């Protein structure tokens, strides 16, 4: 459901397209909402307003060549 509490896993995993819409990007890091979550979940996108700061950092394989 939705109730607005902590939840066990909320990044990656299997999930569901339907469930992804209940997990919405918090304003409480360097990542800022501007959409209250997009509503789509195929390409992501939270808007980063405080670039190159604390809030994780784990380069993908795309950043080994780009």
């Amino acid at each position: 459901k939705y109730s607005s509490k902590p939840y066990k896993v909320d990044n990656m995993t299997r999930i569901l397209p339907q469930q992804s819409r209940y997990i919405s990007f918090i304003k409480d890091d360097r990542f800022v909402p501007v959409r209250k979550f997009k509503g789509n979940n195929g390409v992501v996108v939270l808007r980063d307003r405080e670039p190159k700061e604390p809030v994780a950092l784990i380069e993908t394989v795309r950043q080994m060549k780009d």
């Binding site: 795309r62 950043q63 080994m64 060549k65 780009d66």
Partner: protein, 127 residues
């Protein structure tokens, strides 16, 4: 061509530098993309990941007849392979590996006997 260990990283128009910048790799002296011209192309390619930054100015050209070798006079701790021509067309040569120790009064550096013997020689030849 004539291949040598040596990485990319900034040229440093003036001012003894050699920021780390990724660009991990191997150095090749070749005499151009035509492979006969008296200008010498400094070919890089990654063999050591490059931070996803290229750092190659779509080939770097070698002006001919005026190559001094500064191997480490102007030492500043370990190897930065420095290209003197008129001390302003200065090209800067980064260090990713760190093999064969630092050995004294060969370059004054951190990667010495191999890269210096290959380096001087490649510099002198017109072919």
């Amino acid at each position: 061509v004539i291949k040598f260990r040596a990485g990319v990283c900034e040229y440093n128009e003036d001012s003894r530098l050699c920021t780390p910048i990724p660009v991990q790799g191997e150095i090749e002296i070749k005499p151009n993309e035509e492979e006969e011209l008296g200008f010498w192309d400094f070919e890089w390619r990654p063999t050591e990941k490059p931070v996803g930054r290229e750092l190659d100015p779509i080939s770097l050209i070698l002006i001919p007849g005026e190559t001094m070798w500064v191997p480490i006079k102007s030492s500043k701790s370990g190897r930065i392979f420095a290209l003197v021509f008129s001390s302003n067309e200065r090209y800067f040569f980064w260090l990713q590996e760190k093999n064969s120790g630092n050995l004294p009064l060969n370059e004054l550096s951190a990667k010495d006997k191999e890269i210096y013997n290959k380096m001087i020689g490649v510099l002198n030849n017109s072919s």
